[PDB]
Enzyme design. Structure first.
Site, PDB file in Angstrom:
ATOM      1  N   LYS B  97     -14.821  24.325   5.250  1.00  0.00           N
ATOM      2  CA  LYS B  97     -14.094  25.400   6.243  1.00  0.00           C
ATOM      3  C   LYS B  97     -13.201  24.263   6.558  1.00  0.00           C
ATOM      4  CE  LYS B  97     -12.383  27.884  10.346  1.00  0.00           C
ATOM      5  NZ  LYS B  97     -12.774  29.372  10.745  1.00  0.00           N
ATOM      6  N   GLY B 358     -15.514  -0.979 -21.984  1.00  0.00           N
ATOM      7  CA  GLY B 358     -15.492   0.053 -22.399  1.00  0.00           C
ATOM      8  C   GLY B 358     -15.095   1.052 -23.643  1.00  0.00           C
TER       9      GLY B 358
HETATM   10  C1  LIG Z   1      -9.622  30.267   5.165  1.00  0.00           C
HETATM   11  C2  LIG Z   1     -11.394  30.897   5.475  1.00  0.00           C
HETATM   12  C3  LIG Z   1     -11.506  30.279   7.096  1.00  0.00           C
HETATM   13  C4  LIG Z   1     -13.267  31.190   7.042  1.00  0.00           C
HETATM   14  O1  LIG Z   1     -14.194  31.366   6.544  1.00  0.00           O
HETATM   15  C5  LIG Z   1     -13.293  32.491   8.307  1.00  0.00           C
HETATM   16  O2  LIG Z   1     -15.038  31.953   8.577  1.00  0.00           O
HETATM   17  C6  LIG Z   1     -12.710  32.269   9.647  1.00  0.00           C
HETATM   18  O3  LIG Z   1     -12.509  32.794  10.945  1.00  0.00           O
HETATM   19  P1  LIG Z   1     -11.296  33.578  11.997  1.00  0.00           P
HETATM   20  O4  LIG Z   1      -9.884  32.410  11.672  1.00  0.00           O
HETATM   21  O5  LIG Z   1     -10.962  35.021  11.252  1.00  0.00           O
HETATM   22  O6  LIG Z   1     -11.722  33.845  13.426  1.00  0.00           O
HETATM   23 MG   LIG Z   2     -15.920  31.406   7.755  1.00  0.00          MG
END
Ligand SMILES: CCCC(=O)/C(O)=C/OP(=O)(O)O
Ligand SMILES: [Mg+2]
Ligand SMILES: [Mg+2]
EC number: 5.3.2.5
Lengths: 408, 412
Positions: B97, B358
């Site tokens: 993330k 190469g």
């Molecule tokens: C873009 C994916 C974000 C993600 O994996 C995740 O767990 C988000 O949590 P919240 O921003 O809704 O609290």
């Molecule tokens: Mg998440």
């Protein structure tokens, strides 16, 4: 029959020359030095520059690079007889060595219908998911487990039931939740199933559980099959940490046949740059749908962690375009979602989308139950054409949500 | 026990605030609101910010983004008890993330020795490969097949012989050579082997063939096992199109046990940005070695398609650092290489490297045979303590190469 790749190039040298060098170099190598019989033999394998759209120089880009860079959108055709019908071959052919050639960014890939048919697409898609969740007249709602690392099964079931009691259609493991002695994969599935069944007997609604499918690649099919046998509802999969081909393999295994939810984790290592990588509409949209994802989560245009509006819309469009020979995949804009954003989410993405939230659920003054109720109330309000503040007058949960995060 | 990730952050908001948020958000999520009992129980899972090195604000970067961006190197520790011992978990935990969180670039990953030991490293490494080809001391020489797409087995064997007769130590399939009715995977191996043994019989030179291992993921181990049974010399693998974990799987399967050559195809989708992605030293170097690559090809710092010198050197260092519990992987700087670059290649990368001629080797005036002879003569020259031109005056192949592409100066 050829796959046409569209690229964005920045270069201080002749772009057409480079484009022609790519088309030839990355297919047959050379052409003019070939004997008569060899040319007629390799003609079908020869790549070709289909088009070049000059964009003109950008002062901002020039300043950054300290050089004058010409810009252009280049389209190259690669004969399908040049590679095997699999995604790894597609990527290596269209953006393998080329990904190393300075400023080149892959924007899109277009395929002949016959070639696309060698791929599965989603097994269930939007329609199949709606049938399984039992909701057809509104956007779906999903909550994310929060703070589960280091917790046990008793905590998991307790937390799962609270989210379900809030009225969410689905609950997913956080993508960073890995198998452990405390929370084994199969136990999360079986105990979670039992917990959701108890809530079902109390409300008449069965919330689905998307369990994280992790571990080494060659053990994935075995546990996915076990998941199907044990009654798992959905498999959450960090596809970008593996390979697109792995997602396809899970989709094509008839012994699995469980919906697959693709997470965007690590896709950001490839999509953000203005000069390199692969565009999100292709990386998160077109290819994931083609590979077999029933749901695709991606950063919404609203939170701290986000995507530019047209980028996010582009992904959704690629996921749902009904002109493609694949079932439509569910677009799931994510990150920082709260009830106050529901009006915008539906405005931008329509009814066939999922409102997904973690903190927006658990951060509610009255916990997950209150959080879910606030979201359900917000969705109903938008579909009825009522401002959230008007709807909140008859729904305390929504009122508290609006008071905490506001309305957009 | 924790994995420390080093990131480069660009941001207009407080970097320390973001760092703490990452350490907490990406681990236990909450801490202050937890009762004493839960804290002591979850303490081992709590991520922590290790250090923050503030960098100077860049006028160039600011102008590009049209905003004032603070810059800093942030190091975060992630308890190993938070994730399973596999590369996918490592990536999702340290850059999942987070890779979506604006301007964040992963520069390095440091593992506690005990954690590293759950990974294989190269099966053969530099020592093992040198023994397999029988070449010690001098850098190895390798060439790539030219224009094989659409060709048949007779063409492959004839082209393979020309390259081997040129004196190269290894010949690899082009990374875009996929299986077909004309060139089946197993046939390339068996026909190639026969051709190479015939060459040994006549010139006394031993040459290995790195065959491209392609196709769907779940069919890879079956064909690699077959390759082992057939006596394949090396398996060329486009790892970045499959996932690092697949490379590790091929390395750990005892029924394969064939050297693995990792190709950089698609790695460029991740490494070039100044603000995003993963640094080359980690993506192409450290992780590939740990995963099991015996050879790692990467953009050299010489040709049109290249890498900044320190970047290329960083990859080679990660591949050969003797402080790691893994065998050393062969660094193979590639792209644009020609005989005139041999002195610089050896000066920059040392003797334990591979000169990858190469597909350019075919461009020598006298074909691949002349091309290979030119490279071997250049390598001997440097090892004999002589200038390429000194050896060129005695080796026509080398003189033609120099006349064709010149000599790159090495004098500092
Ligand atoms: C873009 C994916 C974000 C993600 O994996 C995740 O767990 C988000 O949590 P919240 O921003 O809704 O609290
Ligand atoms: Mg998440
Ligand atoms: Mg190649």
């Amino acid at each position: 029959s050829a796959v046409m790749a569209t690229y964005l190039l920045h270069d201080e040298t002749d772009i057409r020359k480079k484009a022609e060098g790519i088309a030839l170099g990355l297919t047959i190598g050379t052409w003019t030095d070939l004997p008569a019989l060899e040319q007629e033999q390799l003609r079908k394998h020869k790549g070709e520059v289909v088009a070049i759209e000059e964009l003109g120089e950008s002062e901002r880009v020039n300043a950054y690079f300290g050089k004058r860079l010409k810009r252009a959108i280049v389209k190259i055709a690669y004969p399908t007889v040049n590679f095997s019908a699999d995604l790894p071959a597609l990527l290596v052919t269209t953006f393998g060595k080329l990904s190393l050639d300075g400023e080149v960014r892959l924007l899109d890939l277009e395929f002949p219908d016959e070639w696309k048919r060698q791929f599965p697409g989603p097994r269930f898609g939007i329609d199949g998911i709606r049938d399984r969740v039992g909701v057809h007249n509104r956007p779906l709602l999903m909550s994310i487990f929060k703070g589960m690392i280091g917790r046990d099964l008793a905590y998991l079931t307790s937390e799962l039931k609270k989210q379900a009691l809030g009225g969410v259609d689905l609950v997913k493991d956080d993508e960073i939740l890995f198998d452990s002695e405390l929370l084994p994969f199969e136990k999360r599935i079986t105990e979670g199933k039992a917990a959701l069944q108890e809530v079902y007997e109390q409300t008449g609604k069965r919330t689905l559980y998307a369990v994280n499918l992790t571990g080494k690649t060659f053990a994935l099919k075995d546990k996915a099959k076990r998941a199907a046998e044990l009654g798992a509802d959905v498999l959450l999969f960090n596809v970008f940490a593996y390979g697109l081909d792995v997602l396809q393999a899970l989709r094509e295994d008839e012994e699995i046949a469980v919906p697959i939810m693709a997470h965007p984790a690590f896709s950001g290592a490839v999509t953000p740059s203005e000069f390199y990588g692969v565009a999100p509409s292709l990386w998160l949209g077109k290819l994931l749908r083609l590979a077999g994802a029933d749901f695709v989560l991606f950063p919404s245009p609203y939170g701290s962690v986000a995507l530019e509006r047209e980028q996010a819309l582009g992904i959704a469009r690629a996921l749902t375009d009904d002109q493609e020979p694949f079932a439509r995949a569910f677009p799931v804009p994510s990150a920082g979602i709260h009830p106050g954003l529901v009006p915008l989410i539906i405005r931008d993405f329509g009814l066939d989308t999922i409102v997904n939230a973690g903190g927006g659920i658990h951060g509610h003054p009255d916990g997950a139950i209150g959080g879910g109720r606030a979201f359900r109330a917000a969705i109903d309000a938008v579909l009825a054409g009522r401002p959230l503040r008007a709807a909140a007058a008859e729904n305390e949960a929504l009122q508290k949500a609006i008071d905490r995060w506001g309305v957009v």
